[PDB]
Amino acid sequence: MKLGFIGLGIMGSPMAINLARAGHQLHVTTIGPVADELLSLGAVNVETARQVTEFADIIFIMVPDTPQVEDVLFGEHGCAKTSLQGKTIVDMSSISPIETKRFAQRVNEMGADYLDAPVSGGEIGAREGTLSIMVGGEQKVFDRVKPLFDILGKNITLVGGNGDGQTCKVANQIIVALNIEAVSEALVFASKAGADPVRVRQALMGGFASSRILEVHGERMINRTFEPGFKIALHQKDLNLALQSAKALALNLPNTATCQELFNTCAANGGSQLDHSAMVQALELMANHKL
Amino acid sequence: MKLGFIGLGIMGSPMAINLARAGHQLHVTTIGPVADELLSLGAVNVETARQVTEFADIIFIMVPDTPQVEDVLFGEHGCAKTSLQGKTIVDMSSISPIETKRFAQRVNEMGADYLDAPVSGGEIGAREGTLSIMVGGEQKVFDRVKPLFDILGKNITLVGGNGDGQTCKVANQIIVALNIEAVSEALVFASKAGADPVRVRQALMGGFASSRILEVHGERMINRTFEPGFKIALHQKDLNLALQSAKALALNLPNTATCQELFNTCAANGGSQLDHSAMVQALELMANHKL
Amino acid sequence: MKLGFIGLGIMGSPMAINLARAGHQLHVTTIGPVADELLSLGAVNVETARQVTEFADIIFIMVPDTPQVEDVLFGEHGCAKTSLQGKTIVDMSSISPIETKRFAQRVNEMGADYLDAPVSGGEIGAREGTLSIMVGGEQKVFDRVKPLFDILGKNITLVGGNGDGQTCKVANQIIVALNIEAVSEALVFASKAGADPVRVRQALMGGFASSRILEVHGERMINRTFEPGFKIALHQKDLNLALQSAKALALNLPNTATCQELFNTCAANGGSQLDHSAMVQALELMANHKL
Amino acid sequence: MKLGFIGLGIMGSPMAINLARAGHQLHVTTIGPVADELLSLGAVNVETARQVTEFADIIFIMVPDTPQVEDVLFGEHGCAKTSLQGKTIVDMSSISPIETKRFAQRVNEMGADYLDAPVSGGEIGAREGTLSIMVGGEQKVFDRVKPLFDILGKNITLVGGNGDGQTCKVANQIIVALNIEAVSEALVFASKAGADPVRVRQALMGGFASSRILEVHGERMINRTFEPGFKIALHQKDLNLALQSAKALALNLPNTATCQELFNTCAANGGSQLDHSAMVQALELMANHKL
């Protein structure tokens, strides 16, 4: 069918490639060079978001921020500069929950359907179609795009109306960040107390301390494996979205605010491009004691 | 063998009752009145402490705080002034890791083995024999008491040498607290953002936000079911061990520090006696938005 | 000389009025309606921006945020596309320190001097000509505009080169926030402890706790007098500059981070429009104890 | 007159010496050696607190903690082991506000008057009689001891009834600690922003950022002068008193809790014996940037 993809970064490119290899028809547009492998599968690289839209019935979007999603939709040569009657816009960018509601609304007033469906899983998840997809929007629309979500991901969930997808993603990033920080506090304390991080993590696995973070990341902190799986610089962007929403909704998120500052400490000490599990280096530095 | 129990009450009592129910002969003692059940089960309520240590090779201690464990060990009517040669003393209280280090070697230089095996599971855990037990000590000693631990709980884990048992428990309590607070910040936010907590929780269940806390405690927050399972006042006393240990070992535990303060807000608003899942109320108060 | 004002409103207006009242001829502009007072005082409300820059050697900018200062500088109807040679541009807005660094050198390579001179004192300060002014730039340039600053405020201070003016303002706002929060934690505590805040405040006045904040704001908290002097919503926008700057420069500002969250609790409970001394209410809420 | 002094540490010794050089009669007792200069002035070193009390009408006490004050008053050979009818006990130790109320009460029931009057100013303040004295108790009693407070200090204040003195001291230590941390955040940010710490501190002096901490300590942070004036290890003790009271009174003191953790970071990095102005090294470490 006629699908369009705007934004082909480390996530967008492989996602589009996945839809193209599934036999779907695609016109794409990105700030820069398109992947040979993508055009190699039928994809047609056009010049603007407006043209992707004039062609497709379902438009996918993968841009860095709320402003890009904003520009792509209503910019000078964007998706709205052409009729959107009967179309479906699927933003899979991680952007403001509040701005999303507004966007989805004005695209509705132009006769189009809106689906906000931010993802999690990183570039590996995107290459292998195992992305986690939290979706905001109406069921019927969700059902309609689902076959496509299936190619792109594994865990797909309709969380509610427009905006809940972005919102669900913010909540996931808050917990992931707070969970990583807790394991860091608990293990660095255990280590400086004289206990063996390996054992404690094992002991704590059976019980209420158990979580996927303690399982995967706790391991990385011990083994010192910090190769990018999700760069700290990226999680800082995610928490920044969290805090700004908190400010707009008047929410007091004491530990999300601190985690952001803890990440600032990682940056200042060469951790911006390491895996967010390296968050542990912050507490080690602060206690002067590595695992 | 022939055992001894030096602390009854909320948890020591049902624990003694389980050991007595397995055929063991126990010489118990405590400040309060020995429950009839264990009296009429073989336990001999020898009027005081030094005595339990006499007719018993393995002595179980289940007292409230670090200082009371020290007096039981080296007090006038204590285990001191009595031969300790060829005996095994096992403290199952949750006390100071650094302290345990020295209580142990003190007892060790008196001719006895020491196992610090703090426990978690609460009242219901002690009665049911399903307590989680983290142990610090020498393997053979652990192996010797093992059959008894088997009667007292399911998850028994030898964490390392003397002190690592306590260190393991503290680490457990830090993560349970930080994880509970994390789910609270994410859901209160998701809620005030307009999303349905049941939904978000459902989504985050399949990814990296997944935890034993979001599953159980998450639910407790949504259905507003806070009947005790583990009192906030209790988790308060525990976080105090972590913070005092942290202070002694010079560790910067920022979110644990904050969590203790948030618990202060709960106690300030009638949450001291509720399940620590009641934590969520602190953030609801700070955001003026419940659920 | 011949001056220009590019931003009126809450503060820009009374500032322009003070310059006009001193005999200077001002070519002003802003989105809203120019107050009659300055119109009937010499100010020529030249319909737009590029024009103010033409008939004026020193241009004053008093716009809300960093981006609006950038558009005034390099926008279509902006100071750009107009010779800037031999001119002096002075931004008195409180914007981003890092941004100002580049706006400055941009203007500098166009043939003009730049002074970033953020101000503090609020509405009443601007009307009364008693604003505090921190300035970043070259001394001779500062010396040139100095006579005008003298009309606008009392405390004028050349802090350093371009950008240090903004950096100085942010530093001011961090301490005012942290000091206000400190007095709040100490007095709420002293109060709930049974002591009289008037007393404690009186004592701490003669020692190291002494501050310009405990003196003024301390009083405001006791007599419950929170009528605006400086809105929390305003100090919120400011703490956001500090936190965004902190994030860019990779600084861990833990208490500033928390203060911003506590302000979120105030906004959540109708304090957005009150004097930032209203901060105390956040801790009163968190302790369930007022005064 | 007949005065007694219990505790002759770095504070107590010079304080007692000051009362002895004023021509007063003194019997003292300390854990250890008494100063030659003190006995040199008439002071009689007795063996126990009970004997100091049997002799004096007004008993001064300078011990490290709530437990010592406790023991000195009701211990096996303390002040209460002798009649206290008509006497006046003056505790100048910094201890729990809550425990104090209880102490003062039971000494009242034994016919004696109680005055809690913790001090601030350190050992220099004690040698030179410039100590700051915050007093809890009844006026008439305060008036009666005042002549003595005059020899010992400079700033003396009756803050209210028994306990308010300790309480007033806790509040002073919270503010001092929070104020020091704020200057540290503001200056380290300013420095990494490129501004000159010297100028900013000067700029900020005129305005609401002004406080004694910014004046004295801000200077020490720039000049790097960290020679003990008040050891961080000591301020950690003071904040520890704060937090435990917070726990007992159910108070949420978010920035006091963090400051304690920030100090833990100083300890772990050799700052336990430096002046609490060295608190700034924590943030520098955390941002990887010294002033």
Side-chain angles (χ1 to χ4, degrees):
Chain A
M1 49 192 302
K2 295 184 177 60
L3 321 171
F5 222 92
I6 300 172
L8 301 164
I10 48 168
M11 302 282 293
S13 186
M15 290 166 81
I17 294 180
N18 282 346
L19 288 160
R21 192 188 306 106
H24 288 287
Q25 201 163 312
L26 270 62
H27 288 202
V28 305
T29 188
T30 187
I31 306 170
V34 182
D36 283 300
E37 205 196 324
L38 179 54
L39 302 163
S40 173
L41 296 150
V44 178
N45 181 38
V46 296
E47 192 190 318
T48 62
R50 174 190 180 168
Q51 302 182 195
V52 174
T53 313
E54 300 186 310
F55 166 74
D57 303 314
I58 303 174
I59 298 69
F60 285 100
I61 302 175
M62 189 61 267
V63 295
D65 51 60
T66 300
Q68 263 64 79
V69 159
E70 205 290 306
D71 208 77
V72 166
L73 289 183
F74 320 103
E76 70 179 307
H77 263 182
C79 300
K81 295 300 173 175
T82 190
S83 181
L84 298 164
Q85 198 67 58
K87 298 196 181 311
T88 315
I89 293 87
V90 191
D91 185 30
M92 303 190 76
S93 309
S94 293
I95 66 168
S96 162
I98 308 180
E99 285 294 286
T100 290
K101 288 167 180 167
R102 310 184 183 301
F103 295 167
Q105 180 192 298
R106 47 203 285 193
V107 311
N108 289 332
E109 301 181 316
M110 294 178 82
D113 276 316
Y114 194 98
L115 280 200
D116 57 291
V119 304
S120 292
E123 105 170 356
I124 293 180
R127 264 192 294 286
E128 304 177 3
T130 47
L131 287 169
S132 287
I133 312 181
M134 293 138 203
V135 187
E138 299 193 290
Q139 197 157 325
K140 263 62 191 302
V141 179
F142 172 102
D143 302 309
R144 193 160 77 225
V145 183
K146 184 62 154 49
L148 310 166
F149 287 147
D150 279 332
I151 294 158
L152 294 165
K154 178 163 170 275
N155 261 291
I156 297 80
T157 307
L158 170 63
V159 182
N162 282 148
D164 293 350
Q166 296 307 329
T167 286
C168 178
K169 173 66 181 297
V170 170
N172 179 277
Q173 296 309 78
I174 288 172
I175 285 183
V176 167
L178 267 55
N179 283 13
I180 291 175
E181 196 288 341
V183 181
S184 300
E185 293 207 2
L187 270 147
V188 177
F189 151 82
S191 179
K192 196 167 183 188
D196 160 35
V198 188
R199 254 59 180 295
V200 188
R201 171 182 169 307
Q202 253 146 44
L204 298 192
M205 213 60 268
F208 292 63
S210 190
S211 70
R212 188 79 88 64
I213 291 295
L214 172 53
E215 194 190 31
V216 176
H217 306 72
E219 201 153 57
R220 294 176 188 160
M221 294 171 203
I222 298 183
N223 305 321
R224 291 277 134 175
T225 58
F226 303 124
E227 278 189 59
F230 193 71
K231 296 175 178 177
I232 283 172
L234 290 190
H235 208 144
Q236 291 227 73
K237 196 194 76 183
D238 278 334
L239 292 191
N240 192 299
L241 265 200
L243 299 171
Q244 291 312 307
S245 300
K247 187 190 163 199
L249 301 187
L251 283 163
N252 189 319
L253 316 201
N255 288 17
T256 297
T258 302
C259 288
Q260 185 65 311
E261 306 308 314
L262 288 172
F263 277 140
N264 281 347
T265 284
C266 290
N269 293 271
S272 283
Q273 302 287 306
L274 303 181
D275 189 67
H276 55 177
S277 41
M279 148 80 86
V280 76
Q281 307 182 317
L283 285 93
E284 302 184 300
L285 190 101
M286 283 149 91
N288 190 9
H289 180 284
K290 301 172 190 174
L291 286 181
Chain B
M1 303 178 239
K2 50 159 52 66
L3 321 176
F5 223 90
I6 298 189
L8 298 179
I10 336 81
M11 309 230 308
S13 185
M15 286 164 84
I17 294 190
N18 258 66
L19 290 174
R21 193 109 69 192
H24 298 287
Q25 210 69 304
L26 272 53
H27 279 279
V28 312
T29 190
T30 177
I31 65 92
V34 177
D36 120 82
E37 190 168 0
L38 74 164
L39 273 178
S40 76
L41 199 56
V44 184
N45 184 189
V46 321
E47 263 74 78
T48 307
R50 168 182 56 61
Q51 284 158 279
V52 172
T53 330
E54 310 195 312
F55 26 55
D57 303 320
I58 295 175
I59 297 78
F60 288 93
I61 297 174
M62 184 69 262
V63 83
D65 55 67
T66 306
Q68 283 183 64
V69 155
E70 189 186 308
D71 194 10
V72 163
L73 257 16
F74 329 95
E76 63 244 79
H77 305 306
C79 300
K81 303 227 175 180
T82 302
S83 175
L84 244 48
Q85 189 64 210
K87 292 184 184 306
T88 310
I89 182 76
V90 316
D91 185 29
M92 295 187 84
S93 311
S94 289
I95 74 182
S96 165
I98 299 70
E99 299 295 286
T100 290
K101 292 274 186 65
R102 75 162 175 291
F103 290 3
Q105 69 182 307
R106 273 213 233 169
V107 163
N108 280 177
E109 59 196 53
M110 299 204 105
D113 287 308
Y114 189 111
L115 288 189
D116 50 289
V119 61
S120 47
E123 191 150 346
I124 297 179
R127 303 169 181 167
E128 230 150 278
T130 64
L131 295 164
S132 290
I133 305 171
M134 0 218 163
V135 187
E138 282 139 344
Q139 190 160 320
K140 306 279 180 58
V141 185
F142 168 90
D143 285 319
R144 180 161 70 224
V145 177
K146 185 48 167 54
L148 311 184
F149 285 145
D150 276 344
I151 301 171
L152 303 174
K154 291 196 167 192
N155 289 342
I156 293 83
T157 296
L158 184 56
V159 178
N162 276 147
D164 290 8
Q166 297 302 351
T167 294
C168 192
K169 176 62 180 307
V170 173
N172 187 275
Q173 298 311 96
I174 286 173
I175 285 184
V176 180
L178 274 56
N179 278 21
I180 290 172
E181 201 276 342
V183 185
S184 304
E185 278 190 36
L187 293 175
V188 172
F189 151 77
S191 178
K192 190 163 194 176
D196 183 330
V198 188
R199 259 57 221 295
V200 185
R201 165 176 175 296
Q202 197 56 57
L204 281 55
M205 215 67 279
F208 275 75
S210 177
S211 88
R212 181 55 175 158
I213 293 298
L214 171 65
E215 190 191 329
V216 181
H217 303 73
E219 191 83 297
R220 288 174 187 178
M221 293 173 214
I222 302 183
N223 308 323
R224 319 301 288 173
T225 86
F226 308 120
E227 285 92 312
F230 195 72
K231 302 180 196 306
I232 287 182
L234 260 148
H235 211 159
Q236 285 238 72
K237 181 266 308 180
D238 283 324
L239 291 192
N240 195 226
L241 277 171
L243 290 167
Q244 289 299 86
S245 296
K247 178 187 156 189
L249 300 157
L251 290 160
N252 185 327
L253 301 179
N255 287 347
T256 300
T258 305
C259 276
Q260 182 65 303
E261 297 310 300
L262 293 175
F263 277 150
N264 281 341
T265 288
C266 296
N269 295 277
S272 292
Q273 289 307 317
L274 310 164
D275 182 66
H276 51 183
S277 57
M279 163 72 251
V280 62
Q281 297 192 292
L283 292 89
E284 290 173 320
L285 181 61
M286 293 152 83
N288 198 7
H289 189 290
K290 309 191 71 63
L291 280 62
Chain C
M1 303 178 239
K2 50 159 52 66
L3 321 176
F5 223 90
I6 298 189
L8 298 179
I10 336 81
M11 309 230 308
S13 185
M15 286 164 84
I17 294 190
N18 258 66
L19 290 174
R21 193 109 69 192
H24 298 287
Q25 210 69 304
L26 272 53
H27 279 279
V28 312
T29 190
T30 177
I31 65 92
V34 177
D36 120 82
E37 190 168 0
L38 74 164
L39 273 178
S40 76
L41 199 56
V44 184
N45 184 189
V46 321
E47 263 74 78
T48 307
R50 168 182 56 61
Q51 284 158 279
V52 172
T53 330
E54 310 195 312
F55 26 55
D57 303 320
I58 295 175
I59 297 78
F60 288 93
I61 297 174
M62 184 69 262
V63 83
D65 55 67
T66 306
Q68 283 183 64
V69 155
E70 189 186 308
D71 194 10
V72 163
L73 257 16
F74 329 95
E76 63 244 79
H77 305 306
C79 300
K81 303 227 175 180
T82 302
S83 175
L84 244 48
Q85 189 64 210
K87 292 184 184 306
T88 310
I89 182 76
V90 315
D91 185 29
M92 295 187 84
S93 311
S94 289
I95 74 182
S96 165
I98 299 70
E99 299 295 286
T100 290
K101 292 274 186 65
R102 75 162 175 291
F103 290 3
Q105 69 182 307
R106 273 213 233 169
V107 163
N108 280 177
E109 59 196 53
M110 299 204 105
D113 287 308
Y114 189 111
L115 288 189
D116 50 289
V119 61
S120 47
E123 191 150 346
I124 297 179
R127 303 169 181 167
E128 230 150 278
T130 64
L131 295 164
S132 290
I133 305 171
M134 0 218 163
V135 187
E138 282 139 344
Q139 190 160 320
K140 306 279 180 58
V141 185
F142 168 90
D143 285 319
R144 180 161 70 224
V145 177
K146 185 48 167 54
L148 311 184
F149 285 145
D150 276 344
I151 301 171
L152 303 174
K154 291 196 167 192
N155 289 342
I156 293 83
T157 296
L158 184 56
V159 178
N162 276 147
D164 290 8
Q166 297 302 351
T167 294
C168 192
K169 176 62 180 307
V170 173
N172 187 275
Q173 298 311 96
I174 286 173
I175 285 184
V176 180
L178 274 56
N179 278 21
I180 290 172
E181 201 276 342
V183 185
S184 304
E185 278 190 36
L187 293 175
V188 172
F189 151 77
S191 178
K192 190 163 194 176
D196 183 330
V198 188
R199 259 57 221 295
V200 185
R201 165 176 175 296
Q202 197 56 57
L204 281 55
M205 215 67 279
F208 275 75
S210 177
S211 88
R212 181 55 175 158
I213 293 298
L214 171 65
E215 190 191 329
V216 181
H217 303 73
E219 191 83 297
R220 288 174 187 178
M221 293 173 214
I222 302 183
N223 308 323
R224 319 301 288 173
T225 86
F226 308 120
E227 285 92 312
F230 195 72
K231 302 180 196 306
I232 287 182
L234 260 148
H235 211 159
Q236 285 238 72
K237 181 266 308 180
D238 283 324
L239 291 192
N240 195 226
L241 277 171
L243 290 167
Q244 289 299 86
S245 296
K247 178 187 156 189
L249 300 157
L251 290 160
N252 185 327
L253 301 179
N255 287 347
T256 300
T258 305
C259 276
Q260 182 65 303
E261 297 310 300
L262 293 175
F263 277 150
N264 281 341
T265 288
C266 296
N269 295 277
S272 292
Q273 289 307 317
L274 310 164
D275 182 66
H276 51 183
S277 57
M279 163 72 251
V280 62
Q281 297 192 292
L283 292 89
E284 290 173 320
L285 181 61
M286 293 152 83
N288 198 7
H289 189 290
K290 309 191 71 63
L291 280 62
Chain D
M1 49 192 302
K2 295 184 177 60
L3 321 171
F5 222 92
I6 300 172
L8 301 164
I10 48 168
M11 302 282 293
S13 186
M15 290 166 81
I17 294 180
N18 282 346
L19 288 160
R21 192 188 306 106
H24 288 287
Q25 201 163 312
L26 270 62
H27 288 202
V28 305
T29 188
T30 187
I31 306 170
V34 182
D36 283 300
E37 205 196 324
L38 179 54
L39 302 163
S40 173
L41 296 150
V44 178
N45 181 38
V46 296
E47 192 190 318
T48 62
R50 174 190 180 168
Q51 302 182 195
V52 174
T53 313
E54 300 186 310
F55 166 74
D57 303 314
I58 303 174
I59 298 69
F60 285 99
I61 302 175
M62 189 61 267
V63 295
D65 51 60
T66 300
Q68 263 64 79
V69 159
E70 205 290 306
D71 208 77
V72 166
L73 289 183
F74 320 103
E76 70 179 307
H77 263 182
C79 300
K81 295 300 173 175
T82 190
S83 181
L84 298 164
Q85 198 67 58
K87 298 196 181 311
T88 315
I89 293 87
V90 191
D91 185 30
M92 303 190 76
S93 309
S94 293
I95 66 168
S96 162
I98 308 180
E99 285 294 286
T100 290
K101 288 167 180 167
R102 310 184 183 301
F103 295 167
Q105 180 192 298
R106 47 203 285 193
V107 311
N108 289 332
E109 301 181 316
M110 294 178 82
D113 276 316
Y114 194 98
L115 280 200
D116 57 291
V119 304
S120 292
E123 105 170 356
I124 293 180
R127 264 192 294 286
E128 304 177 3
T130 47
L131 287 169
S132 287
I133 312 181
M134 293 138 203
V135 187
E138 299 193 290
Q139 197 157 325
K140 263 62 191 302
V141 179
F142 172 102
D143 302 309
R144 193 160 77 225
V145 183
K146 184 62 154 49
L148 310 166
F149 287 147
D150 279 332
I151 294 158
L152 294 165
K154 178 163 170 275
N155 261 291
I156 297 80
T157 307
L158 170 63
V159 182
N162 282 148
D164 293 350
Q166 296 307 329
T167 286
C168 178
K169 173 66 181 297
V170 170
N172 179 277
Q173 296 309 78
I174 288 172
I175 285 183
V176 167
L178 267 55
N179 283 13
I180 291 175
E181 196 288 341
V183 181
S184 300
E185 293 207 2
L187 270 147
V188 177
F189 151 82
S191 179
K192 196 167 183 188
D196 160 35
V198 188
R199 254 59 180 295
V200 188
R201 171 182 169 307
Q202 253 146 44
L204 298 192
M205 213 60 268
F208 292 63
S210 190
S211 70
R212 188 79 88 64
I213 291 295
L214 172 53
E215 194 190 31
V216 176
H217 306 72
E219 201 153 57
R220 294 176 188 160
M221 294 171 203
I222 298 183
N223 305 321
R224 291 277 134 175
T225 58
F226 303 124
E227 278 189 59
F230 193 71
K231 296 175 178 177
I232 283 172
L234 290 190
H235 208 144
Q236 291 227 73
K237 196 194 76 183
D238 278 334
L239 292 191
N240 192 299
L241 265 200
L243 299 171
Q244 291 312 307
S245 300
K247 187 190 163 199
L249 301 187
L251 283 163
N252 189 319
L253 316 201
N255 288 17
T256 297
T258 302
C259 288
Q260 185 65 311
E261 306 308 314
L262 288 172
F263 277 140
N264 281 347
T265 284
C266 290
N269 293 271
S272 283
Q273 302 287 306
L274 303 181
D275 189 67
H276 55 177
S277 41
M279 148 80 86
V280 76
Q281 307 182 317
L283 285 93
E284 302 184 300
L285 190 101
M286 283 149 91
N288 190 9
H289 180 284
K290 301 172 190 174
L291 286 181

